[PDB]
Amino acid sequence: RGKLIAVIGDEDTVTGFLLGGIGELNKNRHPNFLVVEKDTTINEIEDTFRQFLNRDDIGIILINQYIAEMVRHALDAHQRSIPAVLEIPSKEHPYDAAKDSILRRAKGMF
């Protein structure tokens, strides 16, 4: 209820998750998501990420792996409990199995 999950991924992730149960337009007619394409650059990904961070009703952020690598500095610099950022691979992109900050902050793991 209180929070609305955001998504930042290539077309197949976005269309799959919108049918999945999530996604929303606020009263201001603003997407809580973003479809990335090959033409997308880093700055607007960063801008939307920060806009979501300031948006109180995000809660949980799901982003693709390579997108996270585009704005890795934004993830590492920002440290808070509320914005639960995640990492998911796309269909053609291989499995994500490392370089996750949540594992990095717990260095004592494997």
């Binding site: 269309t15 049918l19 149960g21 949980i60 639960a84 995640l86 949540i102 717990a106």
Partner: protein, 208 residues
């Protein structure tokens, strides 16, 4: 600074003994609390990588069902992305006070808005329902993992704070107290010895 500033007296000794006992007990309790927090830290860390493998498997299953639906339908995605009205799954903020500090966790709160009948792209309704189910399971699993790691963050911050406090109490206060007690004992011994010497002298003179 290495000696706590207080004049030697018996009640200084008693007060410092009491403070020593209190500090020792407080250190023991603080170490205990750190131990309990670290136990929880290890316990919730029993599996995030395995939940990550499960996330990957479910995501690939959903992607394959999406590919099948794409074969059945072709260009539903544009229709889906253009028409987004109200969310049918939202998140409830929740709290779980497992220790002295409160941890943030979340719940998969099914708000319940009706889904979208997509009966235009050759109408593979079976494919769409299967896709919706699979992505719903994926969302539930992802919410669970999000709650887990979100609590984990606050947990390890509290742990580091408590460990730092433990080290601070151990390596500063107690040595100072022990040094002060030794100094006090020495000074009282000096006073007693001086009195003894005075008494010896007065007896010596009295022998005449």
């Amino acid at each position: 600074k290495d000696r706590i500033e207080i004049f030697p007296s018996r009640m200084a000794q008693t007060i410092m003994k009491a403070r020593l006992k209190g500090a020792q007990t407080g250190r023991n309790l603080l170490k205990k609390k750190s131990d309990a927090l670290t136990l929880r830290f290890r316990q919730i860390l029993k599996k995030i990588i395995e939940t990550k493998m499960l996330m990957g498997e479910v995501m690939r299953e959903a992607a394959f069902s999406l590919a099948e639906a794409k074969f059945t339908a072709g260009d539903f995605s544009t229709t889906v992305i253009q028409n987004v009205n109200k969310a049918q799954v939202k998140i409830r903020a929740k709290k779980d006070n497992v220790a002295g500090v409160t941890l943030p966790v979340f719940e998969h709160y099914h708000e319940g808005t009706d889904s979208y009948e997509l009966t235009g792209l050759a109408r593979g309704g079976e494919q769409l329902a299967k896709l919706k189910r699979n992505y719903a399971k994926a969302v539930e699993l992802l919410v669970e993992l999000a709650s887990l790691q979100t609590s984990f963050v606050t947990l390890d911050e509290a742990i580091k704070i408590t460990n730092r406090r433990v080290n601070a109490i151990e390596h500063v206060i107690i040595p100072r107290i022990e040094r002060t007690l030794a100094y006090i004992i020495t000074e009282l011994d000096e006073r007693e010895r001086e009195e003894f010497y005075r008494l010896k002298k007065i007896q010596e003179k009295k022998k005449i």
